[PDB]
Design a binder for this molecule. Structure first.
Ligand SMILES: N[C@H](CCCCC(=O)O)C(=O)O
Ligand SMILES: N[C@H](CCCCC(=O)O)C(=O)O
Ligand SMILES: N[C@H](CCCCC(=O)O)C(=O)O
Lengths: 321, 318, 321
């Protein structure tokens, strides 16, 4: 059948050969049968979703079997035949719940390489499949083995820097897509879709399965599953929430430290320092600022051209059209 | 006497022999008399709270002394004996206001290894004992010597990365306690207590002498001296203040960008985007009115639900 | 003429000889005619604003020329003479809109070395002269060359760390000014002015062409073009508005509470309540605490000794003189 995805990965394993992470230089959405027929008899692949650990010799086999077909995947596999780490040709048949850390890592590479957009990928059950790892300057270190390597570094007058301890690495250690700025790459997880013309400032955050159409100025927090449409501005410290799936529309402006708990339609504005939730009651207005009625914000969710603001004289949350 | 604490460290000194930081691989709280008796003669330790420098040769002597007493300390000493960096043995008879840089570091270590909890140790006058230090990829660097090292790196087409300039280092370059998540480790100082099951996200922060029993999802700012009970939450970008001892009870929820200037009791609730302090007047409820009181008075009461009324801007509590 | 500035730099170039960044150890504001006379012939410098590449051999000639005029610059040039990286000598007759990457970098160096203050240097058109770059543990890497290197690191079992993708690098990687703490150096850009006796906590942020006179605790976000006067405080997570209209500045001895936000220039000894956000149009209940009139915040901008606050019983935004 027509594969969902395939990728030749180079990862790291804990002392017991359990995977900690895997790097995928050039992952493919819907590979071609000519690439797949070449490698398929080599991987000992038959069908399904398989994470097939393979050898340095086979890397030379594959590099050859792709001479003529897909030079980049071929040139990728030449390089991988020199690899000091272990290899995992991962081949998915369907967009299905991951059944491996190694497939989990492939699937996060698709969002980040922009090969798929948020929610175009099954990330049901993924958390159990991502070992909580020490992210350090030498790479991935298993939590059980850390203190050891920390001490040895100190003896040699050196430092083993531990810059995150989480089940997600930061995206940029695997991929920086085109036209992107990220001031503090600690703040953007792998699995984030950062669209062309997006500038994530130091105060911005972007979770896995979440992000920006591009362009956009993100100075606030983009929660898991949230998507921000083109032309939008998230101000400093502003919050989105992670039931209902929060989204932001096109040309929206969210002021500094504002909070949104409802979907914002296109060309929406939210005043700095205003937190709106689904249950928050809002004093609706008309083309003037005469009252029309009071309503719950949930019932304004998705509406275009709204201006949410706090009346400073009576503490009333207003909305203008 | 029975020692409060002891630990064998490897640290860094500046050209003028002043200590910048100390790394303690296995600090001991209430070390047995057997260990102390084996180690005191070699160190020159008689009494009190002391940061005693010791030599590569003394490391071998100590290693042998602790064979048949404590294997783990004996093995550390064997590693230590091979060090390229100066060694210090910190023996504290009592828990008192620190009297050295090495002692201060040891006491931050006791918190971050979870051997003691926030407020359990005397940290009075710690600030002067913790030199402001450039934290870099090669290790700790003295501010007076940094600009020269920065230059030399660029000549070799290398970078001397200066990722913090402060008196406290980040915790995880010394210690990662069990069952712990920290999204961005710049955000947790050495001296923070990070309880098992706690996951600290990118916007979460924890100061020294503060932290979490665990579990918890910390996405906000736990100031110095603030402890947060089991199963409590601190949503994105919230804040706690660091006079009156601020804490958070068990099973509590705190909203995003909210701010607590009072000690919240068990199972308390604060609204997202809602800041309260000890002087902010709140409308108490039963939601019929009872009386307008200052949040300082409710401080400690369990099972509350703080909120801001979206029509009249009134701060309320139920 | 008298030069506005000159500086000798060692920098990084991409494959096509384009500058990615320049490091200046000892930049000079208003350098002597004696220093400029020694170097102008050797560099081929006549006039104008120039960034002239010079050779390792020219470095020796410059070093020799400056023995007896300026020893430190001579001492730097002898170091630069041995360097593994390209050199550039930036000489600027006038403080004007940058015309090269090397010049743009110098001006940010002039700011972060405290040789000039925010708004004392012409920074117009600086975004297009600052190339977007990957800031890694091996230095600056061109975005076009990154993926190849990210691959090679994994194959040697190492990690090329990408800690920022941006047009501005973090300041402390170039210069740490005396008498300063910065908890998380990610949050202070090159071009920041961090006055003596400033602490920037982890949640603090200082953009280029902004900063602090000193002393002061900055736990909140100082935007581009904002200068905070001596002895003032910015609490955890607070906000200033930038202009990227009217330039926002904070006066001396001011207090700004956690999560609060300023959209007006605050005069001396001003105070703002924690969690309170004010803008130019925000209508405020002015007091003496007996009412006087409900006026726009813009008319108070710059006034000394004010105390802005939110009335917790009726939501009213006030200001007690
Ligand atoms: N605010 C939520 C936090 C959810 C934590 C995600 C994790 O467990 O690593 C979000 O941004 O999605
Ligand atoms: N409680 C802390 C205060 C900031 C610490 C400042 C210092 O280390 O000199 C906080 O607001 O998180
Ligand atoms: N809030 C604004 C952000 C300015 C844009 C940041 C950039 O494109 O380098 C400020 O700090 O002034």
């Amino acid at each position: 059948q027509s594969l969902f995805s395939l990728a030749f990965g180079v990862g790291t394993q804990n002392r017991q050969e359990a995977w900690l992470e895997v790097f995928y230089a050039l992952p493919l959405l819907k590979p071609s049968s000519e690439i797949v027929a070449a490698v398929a008899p080599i991987l000992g692949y038959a069908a399904g979703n398989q994470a097939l650990t393979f050898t340095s010799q086979q890397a030379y086999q594959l590099a050859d079997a792709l001479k003529g077909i897909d030079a980049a995947q071929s040139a990728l596999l030449s390089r991988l035949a020199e690899s000091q780490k272990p290899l995992v040709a991962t081949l998915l048949a369907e967009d299905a719940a991951p059944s491996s850390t190694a497939e989990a890592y492939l699937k996060l590479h698709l969002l980040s390489h922009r090969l798929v957009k948020p929610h175009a990928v099954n990330l049901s059950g993924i958390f159990p499949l991502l070992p909580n790892v020490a992210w350090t300057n030498i790479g991935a270190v298993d939590l059980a083995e850390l203190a050891e390597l920390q001490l040895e570094a100190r003896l040699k007058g050196k430092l083993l820097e531990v810059f995150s301890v989480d089940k997600f690495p930061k995206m940029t250690d695997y991929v920086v897509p085109a036209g992107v700025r990220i001031a503090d790459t600690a703040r953007v997880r792998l699995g984030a879709y950062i669209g062309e013309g997006t500038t994530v400032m130091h105060e911005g955050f972007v979770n896995f399965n979440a992000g920006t159409e591009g362009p956009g100025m993100i100075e606030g927090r983009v929660s898991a599953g949230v998507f921000v449409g083109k032309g939008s501005d998230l101000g400093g410290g502003c919050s989105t929430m992670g039931n209902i799936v929060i989204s932001v529309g096109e040309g929206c402006l969210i002021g500094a430290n504002a909070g949104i708990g409802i979907p914002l339609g296109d060309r929406n504005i939210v005043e700095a320092g205003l937190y709106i939730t689904a249950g928050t009651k809002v004093a609706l207005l008309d083309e003037q600022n005469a009252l029309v009625k009071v309503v719950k914000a949930r019932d304004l969710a998705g509406q275009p051209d709204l201006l949410f603001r706090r009346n400073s004289q009576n503490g009333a949350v207003e909305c203008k059209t």
